[PDB]
Amino acid sequence: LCRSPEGFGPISFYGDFTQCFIDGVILNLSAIFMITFGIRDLVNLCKKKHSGIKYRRNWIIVSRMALVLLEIAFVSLASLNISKEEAENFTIVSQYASTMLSLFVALALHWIEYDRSVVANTVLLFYWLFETFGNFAKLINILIRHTYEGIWYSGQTGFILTLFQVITCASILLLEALPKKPLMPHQHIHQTLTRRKPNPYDSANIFSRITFSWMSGLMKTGYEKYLVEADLYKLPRNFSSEELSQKLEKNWENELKQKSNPSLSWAICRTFGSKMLLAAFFKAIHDVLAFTQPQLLRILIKFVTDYNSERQDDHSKLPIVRGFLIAFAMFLVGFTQTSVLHQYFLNVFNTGMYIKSALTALIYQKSLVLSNEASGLSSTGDIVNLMSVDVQKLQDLTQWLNLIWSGPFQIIICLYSLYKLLGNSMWVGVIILVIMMPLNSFLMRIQKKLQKSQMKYKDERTRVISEILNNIKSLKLYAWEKPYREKLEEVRNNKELKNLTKLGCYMAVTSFQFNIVPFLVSCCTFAVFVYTEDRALTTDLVFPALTLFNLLSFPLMIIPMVLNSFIEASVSIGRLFTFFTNEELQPDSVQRLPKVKNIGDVAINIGDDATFLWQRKPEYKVALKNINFQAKKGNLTCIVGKVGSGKTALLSCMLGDLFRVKGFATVHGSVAYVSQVPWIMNGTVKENILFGHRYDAEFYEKTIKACALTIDLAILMDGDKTLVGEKGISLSGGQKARLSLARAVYARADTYLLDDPLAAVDEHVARHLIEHVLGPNGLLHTKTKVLATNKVSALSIADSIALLDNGEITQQGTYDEITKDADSPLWKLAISLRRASDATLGSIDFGDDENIAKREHREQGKVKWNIYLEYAKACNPKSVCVFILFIVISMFLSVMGNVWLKHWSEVNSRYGSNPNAARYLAIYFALGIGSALATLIQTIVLWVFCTIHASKYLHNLMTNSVLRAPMTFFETTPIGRILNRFSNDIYKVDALLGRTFSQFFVNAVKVTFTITVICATTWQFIFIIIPLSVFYIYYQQYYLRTSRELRRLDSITRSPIYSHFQETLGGLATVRGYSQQKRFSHINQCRIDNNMSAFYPSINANRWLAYRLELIGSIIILGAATLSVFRLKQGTLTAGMVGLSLSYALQITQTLNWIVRMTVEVETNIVSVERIKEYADLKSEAPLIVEGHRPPKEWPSQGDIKFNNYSTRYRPELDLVLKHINIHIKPNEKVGIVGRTGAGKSSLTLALFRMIEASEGNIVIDNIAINEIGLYDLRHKLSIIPQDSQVFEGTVRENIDPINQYTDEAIWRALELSHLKEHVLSMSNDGLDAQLTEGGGNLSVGQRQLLCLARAMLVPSKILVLDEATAAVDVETDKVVQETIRTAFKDRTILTIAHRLNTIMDSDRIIVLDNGKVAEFDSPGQLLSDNKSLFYSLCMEAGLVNEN
C-alpha cells in the first residue's frame, strides 16, 4: 500500500503521473528487466570461446567506467536524506533497494561487453533509455507541485540530486550509442581484398536498425557520381540461393515420401512462415494506435470549453498545464505509430525475396532429369513462362496477405467507435455501404474487359509495321509508300483511338463514384440525428466524427483488389504442382566402370537377349530385342541399317535414356558424343572449342590443323573473336558439323560415339578426315570408337561390322566374309595423350556501363526543361489551363463546406436546441455536391481532349519522317532497335504518362490549402514552416538522383536469367552426354545472385525516405497544438477554431510522402518523348516532285542512254567507285553487262535510279538531264526485275496492283503468260480474293520468281533492267524468261547484268568493267575471234572456249 493522499491512479489532477506510479511501477520494471536478462547474457558471453580479434583500450571504456561509478554515489547520498515520515511508505523505500543491485550488474557487464562483442549490447541500450525517462518525469512532477501549491514536497537536497541524476544517465546513453571501438595496430592484412566490401547491415546497433541510418553512406555516393556495378556491397548472411533451396528440398521430399496426399503449399508455409507470424503483431499494434487520436481531440475541445466558461462566469481553478500535456501526448502517439509500421514492411518484403530464389533454383535443377517424352509434351517457349510469370505472382501476393484479416478489423473498430458518440443514429452508415460496395465491384469488371480488348490492336499495328520495315528495299523501288501508309493509318485511327475514349469515360465515372461516398454517409447521419434525438448537436460531436468517417476511405478501396490476386495465384500453384511430379529417368539402366588397360580388352557388353522400351506409358513399346553386341579397344566398329531401324536406338541405349526390362549393360571410361544435328552455344569460337577445359596451345593447333577449319578462318577474315549462335552471324552447312567434331576431338575421351557426321561435307573432305582423324593414321589410334554410318569408305576401312534391323541383330563379321559369303546389301550396294584438365570455378563478371556513362557524364538532371514544353505544345495549351483551373475550384468548395459546418455548430450551442434544421442542411448538401461535379469535369477534359491529341500528333509526325530517310539509315541501324520505338515508347505515351501528372498536381494543391487554413488562425506558424521547407528540399534532392540509377541497374540484370534457361533447354542431350551438369547449375546460381544484390538496396531506399518525411508531420501537429494553447491564455480562442485547425493537420502525414514518390514516376516516363523527337527530326531526301519540269506522259519514247563523264561514290568519306564513264547505248539494243567479282557492278543501277547522288558529271536520257526531274516522276517510269523476291500479306490483287489502275483482263493475261493460274485456283475458289500468308509460305521460290516476272509483265515501258536476277533465277525458269524476252519485251531496250557468261552469249554488245574503269566495249564475235583479248580470256575462265 501507499501512505499518500494521491493513490495508484495513473493520472493526477494536473495531468501528469502521480509519484506513487513513477516509483512503484516504471522504476521497478526497468530494474527487474536488467536483473533477469543481464545475468543470462553475461553467462552466454562467458561460455563463448576466446577469439583472435582484440580491441585496444582507450578513453572510451575509461570514461564509461568513470561515469557509472557516480550513479552509485548519488543513490547512496539520496538514500540517507529520507525523512521520518517517508520511511513508513513501502513504495519509496523499495525503490533504492531495487535499483542498487542492477547498478552492480550493469557495471560488471560493461567490462566483458567491451572485449567479447562487435556491436553494442541491446539490453544496455534499452535500460538507460527507460531510466532517463523515469527520472525526467519525476523532475517535472516536483516542479509543478511546487508552483501551484507553494511547498517543496522534498527539500532542495532531493531536487538538486534529481537534477544531477538525470544528466549522468543522459551522458552514459550517448557514450554508449555513438563512438566506435578502435582495432589494434596489427594483424589487419585481411583488409586487402579486390572484391566488393562487406555489407554495413551486419554491424549496426539496434537504434540504427530502427531508424535505417546504415543506408546514409550510399546516398552521398550516388548524389555525386553515376553508380556502376563496382559500387554495390555484398549480400548479407543467409541470402545465398544454394543455402535457401536446400531447406525447401528437405521439407518437400519428406512431404512426398512420408504420407499419401502431398501438397506444395504446406511445404512452403512450414519453412518460411515464422517471420510472417511476427509481422502480424506490429500490424495489430499500428491498427490500435491509429484510432486513439480522435479521443485526444475530443478531450482537448472539451477542456477549451470548460476553461472559457468558468473564467467568463467569474467575469460575470483548472490549471493551464493540463493543456500543454495533451499536446505532447499527440506527438508521442505519432512517433510510436511511425516506428512500428516500417518494421512490419521489412519483414513482409524479405519473404518475397526468399520465395523467388528458392523456386527458381528448384525449377532449373528439375529440368535436367525429365525423360524424353515428358520433355516432348510442351513447348520450349512455354516452360520459360514458369519463371517469367508464375513465381512473379507468388512474390507479389505476400505484400497483401495480412489485409484479409486487417481489413475488417479497422472497420469494426470504426463502427463501434461511432456507436458511442451518436447512439442508434449510426445504423444509416451501414446500409449505404451495403448498397454501394457491390456496385463498385461490378464496375471494376467492365474495365478489365475493355483493357483486355485493347491489347489486341497493339499486336495488329506491330505486325503491319514490322512487315513494312523488312521489305523496304522493294518499297523504295516501286514507289508503293502511298497505299501502305494509308493502310496503316486506317487501322491506327479507326479502332485503337476509338477504344481509348471508351476506357477514358469508364475511368471518369468510377472516380466520381468513389469520391462521393464518405460525404454522403455524414450528410445522412447528421440528418437522421437532428430529427429524432432530443439533444443539441454541438462542436465536440461534429468535429471528432469527421475524422472517423474519413478513416473509412482506405479499407473500402483495397478490399476488392486483394481478392483478385488471391484468386489469380491459385492457378499458378496447380501448374507448379503439375510440373514437379513428372516422370524421371531410370537410374539403374546402365552401369559405369573404370578404364580398360590393354588393346585386347572388350569395352562394352550387351547380351542375354536384352530388351529396351521406347515408352513406359500408356502401353510399353518394344524398341530393341535379342541384342548381343561387343566392341574392342582401338578398332573402328561400324553399324549399317535402314532409316528408322534400331540404328539410333543403340546410341540412345548406350547414353542410357531407354528403360531396361531384361539383360545387362556396361560401359567403361568416359564418353564423348556428337549430336546428328549440331548445337552451337552463344560465345566465341575459342570457347566453343575449349568447352570448359584448360588451354594447351600445341594440342589446340594440332586439333585445328587436323580439320579444314583453318581455311574457313582465313576466308572469313575474322579470327576466333567472331560471335556465333542465334545472335551471332549465321554459319552454314558443313561448318557446324566440322566445329562440333573439332569440339569433340579436343576432349581426348576414352570412348567416342559418332552419330554419322560425315553426311554434311564434301567427299574429299571426308577423305581428309579419314586420313587425319579416323583409322590407324590419326590421333585416335588407341581410343575405341563406334561410328554409325552408311559410307562405303568407312565400312571398307571398318575392322568389324554388324547388321541391325527390325530391332534385332541378324549378321556380323569382318568384310572379307561379307564379300565372300553374305550375299547381302552390305556387298550388294599402348599410350595416348592424357585427359585434359578442367578449368576452375569462380564468379561471373559484370559488364561496364562506361560505354553510356561517357555520354551521360556531361550532366546530371539530364532531362531538360525543353521536353516538358514540347509535350505541352503537343497538347493544345489552352486545354492544360482549363484542366488546371477545375482542381482549384474543387478544393475551394470543399473547404467552404467545413467553414459552414463550423457556423452551424456555433449557432446550435447557444440555444441548446436545433432551430431551422431544414434550412441549414440544404446549403451543406449543395456545397458537398458541387465539389464532386468539378472532379468529374476535369477527368473528362484530361482524357478526351489533352491526351488523345498528343497520341494523334506524335505518331503521324514520326512515321512521315522515317519513311523518307535515305538508305544509309536503314543499312547502319539494326531493325530490332527501330521496331522498339514503334512498339514500347508509343505505348507509354498512350497509356501511362498522363496519369502521373494528375496524381502529382492533385496532391500538391492539397497541402497548400491545408497550410493556408492553419496559418489563418495563428499567424506565428510562419516561423515554423520556413525552416522545415529547407529540409524537405534537401531530402527530395538526395532521393531523386540515387533511386533512378538503382532502378536502371536493377532492370538491365533481369533478362540474362531467362536467356540461359532457353539456351540450355535445347541442348540436354549434349550436356548429359558430357556430364556438365554441375558447371551448368553453378552458372545459373551466379546469375540469380547478381540480380538480388542490386534489388536489395532499391527497396531499402524507400524506407530511408519515408521515416524522415513522416517525422516532419509530427512536428507540424505539435506546433499547431501548442500555439493554440499559448493563444488561449490571452482570452481570445474559442472551441470552433481549434476544432477546424486540428481536424486538417491530422490528415497530412501520408501526402507529404506520396508527392516525392510521384516525382520519380514522372521523371522515369518523360524520356520516351525525347526518344520519339529524336527520330522525328531525322534527315531528309531529295524532293519527290519538281512542278515546273514535269515530263509528258510518254517521255521515254526512245531507249537511248548517254553518259557525260559521270563519277560517283557510295559515301563522301570513301573513294570514287565509278570514274570518267562515257558510254552510249543505241535504242532497242540488247546489252550484256559483265565484269569480275567486286569490280563495282552493283553501283550502276543505283546510279541509274538516283539512289546515289552524282559526284561528277551527269546521266542523260532522251534529251533531258535526269537531275532536274522530281524523284517520283523519274522512278515511276523505269521497269526493273529485282534480284530479291518479296511477298506481302493480303490478296494476290494487292500483290500485283494495290492501286487498282488496271482491268482484270490484263491481270489474268499476265498470269496466263506466267503459268500461275493453275496453282492459285487449287488453293482457293476465291480467285483474286485468295489471300497469301506471311512471307509467302504458300509460294515456292520459283513461284515467287514467276510472281515478280508477272509484276514486271504488267508495267508498260520502253526500258527494262534485269538487275542481277540471274543470281537467284535458275535456268529452268530462265528458259521461260528468255522466251518472254523474245516475245513480250522484244521492243524494249534491255540492260542485262550477268551472273555467268553463258546466259548472255546472244548480246549485241558487251561492256567490260574493271575497277571502276571501262576495259573495252566491243562486239562479242570480234572478241571471241581475238584469242588474246580480255573477254576471250574471261570465256576461257568460264571454260566456254575449251568447250567449243
Ligand SMILES: N[C@@H](CCC(=O)N[C@@H](CSSC[C@H](NC(=O)CC[C@H](N)C(=O)O)C(=O)NCC(=O)O)C(=O)NCC(=O)O)C(=O)O
Ligand atoms: N495508412 C496505410 C499505410 C501506408 C500504406 O499502406 N501505403 C501503401 C501505398 S498505397 S497509395 C494509394 C492512395 N494513397 C494516397 O493518395 C496517399 C494518401 C492520401 N493522400 C492521404 O490523404 O492520406 C490511396 O489509396 N488513396 C485513397 C484515398 O485517397 O483515401 C503501401 O502499402 N505502400 C507500401 C509501399 O509501396 O512501399 C495503412 O493503413 O496501411
